Amino acid sequence: ACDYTCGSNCYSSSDVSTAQAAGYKLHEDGETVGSNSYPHKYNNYEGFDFSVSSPYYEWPILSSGDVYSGGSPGADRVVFNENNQLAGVITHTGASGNNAVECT
């Protein structure tokens, strides 16, 4: 079973932790990757009830299991905060335009 399911993509807690560590590492170094500059602030326009405090940052999580290193970020994102706490896993899949929904 998936710990997080973003559309058709299935993620385990281990996939999420691995992606989160990568994103957070770049964040503490003031570094960014990809044409879209990841990680970057996640504004929470959707107003998800993250139990973890802001500010929030998003980083891509890939269905291939690889850690994001530039190139196509796909539609899935791990969201974490300043304390390296997981806020949630979200996706653009199944959401109109640039909106996002949570992975269930």
Give the binding site for ligand 2GP (CB under 6 A).
36, 42-46, 58, 77, 98-100
76 binds Ca ion, rule: CB under 5 A: no
Q: Is 92 a catalytic residue?
A: yes
- Helix, strand, or coil here: 103? coil
- Helix, strand, or coil here: 25? helix
Q: Is 40 a catalytic residue?
A: yes
Give the number of residues in contact with Ca ion, rule: CB under 5 A: 2
Check: CB of residue 53 under 8 Å from CB of residue 84.
no
Indicate which residue of 28, 31, 46, 92 is catalytic: 92
Backbone CA torsion sign across 19, 68, 94, 78: positive
The residue ranges that bind Ca ion (CB under 5 A) are 15, 65
Residues marked as catalytic: 40, 58, 92
